[PDB]
Design a protein around this ligand. Structure first.
Ligand SMILES: O=C(Nc1ccncc1)[C@H]1C[C@@H]1c1ccccc1
Ligand SMILES: O=C(Nc1ccncc1)[C@H]1C[C@@H]1c1ccccc1
Lengths: 470, 469
C-alpha cells in the first residue's frame, strides 16, 4: 500500500509552518535547467500522475499511519494532520492541485518550462511543494529517453553515411539493462523510456508499463530474439563449446539467434568454430534468421574490429553502394559490453574508418542505458516561482551569488512559439500580454483527475528525429 | 500483479532449449568480483526473497499472461509453458530452488561467494538462471550500503583525529536522495541500505521497507529534524530573507533546525543576517536545539571553509583538546550540495588543514548516495559454476582470453574463515574436505519458503566499523 503522505522528503512535513502567514497560493515549475544534451524528451509524468497522484489518495488510515511514523521519525509532533484531514473531508481525498505540462514525447530545448504545479484551494498552499519529491522523479524517464535519443542520432548519422538509408535503425540499440538497474520499478520505467526511441528490449518490465499507462496499437511496443548466455555455453564443458554452438543454432534455425562467443577465446570461436567447423550451419541460414555473433569482453572497439576482420576472411563480404564492407545477410554482430553514449560513438567511428558498414552491427547497453544517469545530467529541477500572500501575487526566485546556473525563473510561466518557430518560456505572467500567441502547456491534472494524456504511439511520433521526419 | 514469469531478461525465456540435454542441476553463485572498495556489505537479499520469490508465485493466469506476451514479443512460440505448469502442479506454484547466503550485514572482501542458487528438482534445471535477473538487482542495496560505509570510515577517521571521539558519527551523513533516484521502489531500497550505517534520512520510503522486511527494536530506524527549503525562504520575497529566517527559527525554537542560507547570498546571510541582525535568536538556543546553517551552492570545499571563517568571526569559537576550532554548541553547518565519497574526503581534509573540527559539520548526500552507482563499481555478478548432466557433476566457468578479470569460479562453492581469521572461498567442492571449518553460507530460501531471516538490528551489528568495535 502506497501512501502519498509518506512519499515526500521528511523536511517537507514541516514546511506548512514556514511559508509567510496568509499564503493562499504556491505555484512551482519544473525545467531541465540550462548549464551537449541541448534538447530533452519530455516523458514519464503520465505514469506518475496515474500510479500515484490521481483519485482518492488520502484516507483516514493513511493519515493515522503518517502521524504515527512522523511522531517517531521527528521525535516530535510536527505533522499537519489538520491539512490532510481537510483534503479528505472536502475533496474525498483527491488532491486540489492543477498541473499543466508540455505534451509527452515533445523535444524541448534546455531551460524551458516543462510543467507547472499549483494548488486550487487556498487552504492547500502547502500541497504544491509536498509533491515536489514524487514529481521530480520524472527526471529519470526524461533522462533515459533523452540519452537514448542522443544515441539514436549517432547511429542514424553513421548508418546513413555507411549504407545510404536508415533501415533497421530502431533495432540498433537494444536494452540489456534489467539486471543492472536499482529496482523492478526502475526497470519498467527506464525500459519504457528507451522504447520511446527504439523497439528492441530484453527488459520485459517495460512492456507492461506501456500497456497499462500509455498504450500502443500494436500488441507490444518492443521485441527480442532468442539468445545464449555464458551459462548455456559453459554448461557443456570447456572442450564442448562447439557442441553448444551447434545445438543452439540448430534449435533456433529459422529465427535470428544471438550467441555469446567469448566464453574462452572469442577469436578462436569466430575463426575456427563459426568460421570453419560450423560454417555449413551458418551459410545455410535465411536473411530473416541470421546468426548474430556476440563478443562480450576486451576493448569494445578493438574487439569489434578484430571480430569483423576475422569474419570477413571466413565469409563472403560484399561492398555496398556507399563503398562499405558488408557481411552476408545471414551473419551479423552485436556488441553488448561496455556500451554507453561515448563508446557507442567511438565504435561506429572506428568501424567507419575501417570501411565497415554500420549495417553489420547492433549494440546492447545495460547499465549505460538505464542506470549510469543522474538528475544532474540535465539539471532536472523543481522550483517555486509565484506565491500569493495577503491577496498579493509576488514573483519569487532563487539566485545564489556563487552559482548563476542555479538561478530560477520568476513569476507565472508559459511556453510559446517564437516567430521563427522555436520555443520560448515567458516569465512574470508576460504570456498574458498575448504577444507570443497561446500557451503551449496543457492542463494534464486537476483536482484528482487526469485531464489529458497521450498514447505511446503519439509519444513516439513526437520524439522522432528530424532525419526520420524528412 | 507482479508476475515472476515476466520478471527476467527476455533471452532467458529461451534458455531451457540451450542447456546440454540430460542436465538435472544448474548451480550458480553471486560475487562482487575482484578487479578502493576492498570489502562489501552484504545486504538486501531478504527483501527480494520476501517480496518476489516466496510462496505461490506461479498461477494458471500468470502462465497464460506470459505465454501471450512472449508470443508477440518474440513473434514466435518459444516460451516453456510445460516447465512452469510443472511447478504449478507439483509444488503449488512454489519455486523448487535453494539459496544459501552469507548473513546480511556481513562485511566480506571482494571475490568471495556471497550467495548460491540451485534447483531442487531435476525438471527445473532451467529455473536457477531464470531468476538471475531479479537476484542480481541485489547489487544495488549491496553497493549503497558499501559506499555509505566507506564514507562512514572517512568521517570516523577525521572526527577521531579532530575531536578525539566518534560522538555523533551516525548522524554525520544524511540521506537527501529521495528526489534524485529513479523510482519510489529504488528510494526505499537505497534509503534502507544507507541506514545500515547511519541514522539520518529524509528518504521516508526507507522506514517502511525496514519495518516490513527486516524489523528493528526501536520504533523507527532513521530520524530527521525540521528544515527549510528554498521555497519557504524565497516565498517571503527577496527583501524579506531576514523575516523568513526569523519566522522559521522561532517556529522551531526548541528543536534542531536546518536553514538553507544561499538563496541570494550565502556570505551576506552568514555575516550580516545570522551574524548580526538575528544573532540574538541564535546565541539563546539550547545545545539540543542548534541552528544548522545550510549552504547549497558554490565549490563545496571553498564554501564550507568561507562559511566557517565568517561564523568564527561573528560567534565565540573555542579550541578543543586536539587543537581544533569549534563553533558554539547552538550553531552547526550542513553541506548538502555536491557531496559524494570523493568530495566528502576533500571537504574533511580541507577542514582539517584549516584547523576546523569535524564536529562542526554534517553532510547531506542525494544523488551521490543513492543514484550515482552502478553494478560495475563492485562488479556484482551471477555465474553458473556447476552442472550435473547424465548424472555426472561438471565444474564449469568462463575465462575470456582478453579479460582475466571476468574469469568465474569453478564447481561447488563454500565460504570459510581462514586460520588467521580472514575469509576464503573454496572451489570444486573442496569445502567437503572439512579442512576449513563450517561453511558460512546458510540456507535462506528453500522450495518457496524463507528459511532464515535477520533483523535490521542484527544487520547493523554485523556491518559495524572496526573503530566502532
Ligand atoms: O544479444 C542478445 N539479444 C539480441 C541480439 C540482437 N538483437 C536483439 C536481441 C542477448 C544476449 C544479450 C543479453 C540480453 C540481456 C541481458 C544480457 C545480455
Ligand atoms: O538539512 C536538512 N536536514 C537535516 C539537517 C541536519 N540534520 C539532519 C537533517 C534538510 C534541508 C535538507 C534537505 C533534505 C532533503 C532533500 C533536500 C534537502
Amino acid at each position: 500500500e502506497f501512501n502519498i503522505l509518506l512519499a515526500t522528503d521528511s523536511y517537507k512535513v514541516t514546511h506548512y509552518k514556514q511559508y509567510p502567514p496568509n499564503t493562499s497560493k504556491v505555484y512551482s515549475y519544473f525545467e531541465c535547467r540550462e548549464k551537449k544534451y541541448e534538447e530533452t524528451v519530455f516523458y514519464g509524468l503520465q505514469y506518475i500522475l496515474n500510479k500515484y497522484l490521481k483519485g482518492k489518495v488520502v484516507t483516514k488510515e493513511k493519515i493515522q499511519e503518517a502521524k504515527d511514523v512522523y511522531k517517531e521519525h521527528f521525535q516530535d509532533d510536527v505533522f499537519n494532520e489538520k491539512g490532510w484531514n481537510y483534503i479528505l473531508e472536502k475533496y474525498d481525498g483527491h488532491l486540489p492541485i492543477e498541473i499543466k505540462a508540455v505534451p509527452e514525447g515533445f523535444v524541448i530545448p534546455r531551460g524551458n518550462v516543462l510543467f507547472t504545479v499549483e494548488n486550487t484551494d487556498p487552504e492547500c498552499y502547502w500541497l504544491t511543494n509536498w509533491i515536489e519529491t514524487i514529481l521530480v522523479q520524472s527526471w529519470y524517464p526524461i533522462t533515459v529517453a533523452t540519452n537514448s535519443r542522443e544515441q539514436k542520432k549517432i547511429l542514424a548519422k553513421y548508418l546513413l553515411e555507411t549504407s545510404g538509408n536508415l533501415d533497421g535503425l530502431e533495432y540498433k540499440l537494444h536494452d540489456f539493462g534489467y539486471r543492472g538497474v536499482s529496482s523492478q520499478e526502475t526497470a519498467g520505467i527506464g525500459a519504457s523510456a528507451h522504447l520511446v526511441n527504439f523497439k528492441g528490449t530484453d527488459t520485459v518490465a517495460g512492456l507492461a508499463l506501456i500497456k497499462k499507462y500509455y498504450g500502443t496499437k500494436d500488441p507490444v511496443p518492443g521485441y527480442s530474439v532468442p539468445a545464449a548466455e555464458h551459462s548455456t555455453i559453459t554448461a557443456w564443458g570447456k572442450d564442448h563449446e562447439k557442441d553448444a554452438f551447434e545445438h543452439i543454432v540448430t534449435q533456433f534455425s529459422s529465427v535470428p539467434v544471438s550467441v555469446v562467443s567469448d566464453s574462452y577465446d572469442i577469436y578462436n570461436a569466430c575463426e575456427k568454430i563459426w568460421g570453419e567447423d560450423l560454417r555449413h550451419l551458418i551459410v545455410s541460414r535465411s536473411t530473416q534468421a541470421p546468426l548474430i555473433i556476440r563478443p562480450d569482453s576486451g576493448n569494445p572497439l578493438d574487439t569489434v574490429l578484430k571480430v569483423l576482420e576475422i569474419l570477413g576472411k571466413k565469409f563472403p563480404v560484399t561492398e555496398n553502394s556507399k563503398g562499405y564492407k558488408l557481411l552476408p545477410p545471414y551473419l551479423r554482430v552485436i556488441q553488448g559490453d561496455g556500451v554507453d553514449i561515448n563508446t557507442l560513438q567511438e565504435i561506429v567511428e572506428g568501424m567507419k574508418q575501417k570501411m565497415w558498414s554500420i549495417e553489420n552491427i547492433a549494440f546492447g547497453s545495460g547499465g549505460g542505458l538505464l542506470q549510469k544517469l543522474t538528475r544532474d545530467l540535465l539539471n532536472c529541477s523543481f522550483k517555486c516561482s509565484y506565491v500569493v500572500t495577503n491577496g498579493l501575487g509576488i514573483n519569487v526566485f532563487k539566485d545564489p551569488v556563487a552559482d548563476p546556473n542555479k538561478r530560477s525563473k520568476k513569476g507565472r510561466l508559459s511556453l510559446h512559439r517564437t516567430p521563427a518557430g522555436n520555443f520560448v518560456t515567458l516569465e512574470e505572467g508576460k504570456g498574458d500580454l498575448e504577444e507570443y500567441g497561446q500557451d503551449l502547456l496543457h492542463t494534464v491534472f486537476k483536482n484528482g483527475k487526469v485531464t489529458k494524456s497521450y498514447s505511446f504511439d503519439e509519444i513516439r511520433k513526437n520524439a522522432q528525429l528530424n532525419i526520420e521526419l524528412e
